Amino acid sequence: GKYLRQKRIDFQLPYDILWQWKHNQLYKKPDVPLYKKIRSNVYVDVKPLSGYEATTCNCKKPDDDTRKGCVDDCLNRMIFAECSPNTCPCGEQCCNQRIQRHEWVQCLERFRAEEKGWGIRTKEPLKAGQFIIEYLGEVVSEQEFRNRMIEQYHNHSDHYCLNLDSGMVIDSYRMGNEARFINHSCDPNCEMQKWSVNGVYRIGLYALKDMPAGTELTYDYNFHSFNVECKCGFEKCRGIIG
């Protein structure tokens, strides 16, 4: 043919370039960290069930269709659950469905940190309490993460993992999202909150304060139960992460 109706094939780089990058056998290693990007958590052998579900929050849908509902006055927000879209009385004006609606802040820029390797910044200002991005990875058990840590993962110096309370770990060594590049600060500007979305536990990043564009996203590693093995710059710096 010449003269042929092409069929949409999504672009993906060829096998050789991928194999050369993964094995550091090209003209120069690109400043690109090897991790697989996922859209949602991958339950390896455990599902992080929250233990409970949502309800109908009695929140009164505002007369003005643009005012947000369930804004810090909601029952589900008091139990860290996201409103079900077909039971929330606020309907389509519900603010308490940010995670399941995939309402990220799409102003995130990766960069090379000064003494931390990788880091993330925001190219737009962010009001306080705003939802940033979900921390994605492989939901593994305690034993499976110990397996991966002792016999598979070598770069323990920068652990790409977050912990869940029930002994489960969100391992972002192999698979995850950009949130694996968010480093630590003793005086953080963000916070990791655990929410019950459709009865499953999810972890989201939220703004602890107002911040202008260009600031680096940081959260406290001590306030989240994992560092079983620092140069942040704060005045009351804890010396080492712990």
């Binding site: 010449k2 999504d10 672009f11 780089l13 370039i17 090209l26 990007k37 995130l108």
Partner: protein
């Protein structure tokens, strides 16, 4: 029976491009500050001033025409990531009578040379200049690799706006 060899000096930029599009959710500044048309004209001008005076220029212009045609026929269907499809639809809507060689720039031109070998060896749009393009592409790629620094950069990429993810 045709496979295009991408220079070793260009594969790291393809890795960077994949990382910027699929994993950092960035977009190339469309329309390009220097489009495929101007890049092809720069290559033509760089090929004119050499040893063989005037006895190679016809084939050079014909190869430029073939490259532009294959880019314009393969861009929207084979040279696009899944994340760039809303941008492609917006470009098609705003500029209907504008071939892709006027909109896109160096990275998509490079992406052409990783899948053109399928169409050259099985569905060639022109069998009268097929053998000439096969002769010249492994030198056009060398030109691109020599100018990689000025052609390919992360400065032409921007973080996608939040309304783009809603598409």
């Amino acid at each position: 029976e045709v496979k295009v060899k991408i220079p070793e000096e260009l594969k790291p930029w393809l890795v960077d491009d994949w990382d910027l599009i699929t994993r950092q959710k960035q977009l190339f500044y469309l329309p390009a500050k220097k489009n495929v048309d101007s890049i092809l004209e720069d290559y033509a001008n760089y090929k004119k001033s050499r040893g063989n005076t005037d006895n190679k220029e016809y084939a050079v212009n014909e190869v430029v025409a073939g490259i532009k045609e294959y880019f314009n026929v393969m861009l929207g269907t084979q040279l696009l990531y899944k994340f760039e499809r809303p941008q492609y639809a917006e470009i098609l809507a705003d500029h209907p009578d504008a071939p892709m060689s006027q909109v896109y720039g160096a990275p998509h031109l490079l992406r052409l040379f990783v899948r053109i070998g399928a169409m050259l060896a099985y569905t060639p749009l022109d069998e009268k200049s097929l053998a000439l393009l096969l002769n010249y592409l492994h030198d056009f790629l060398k030109y691109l690799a020599k100018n990689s620094a000025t052609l390919f950069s992360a400065s032409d990429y921007e973080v996608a706006p939040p309304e783009y993810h809603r598409k």
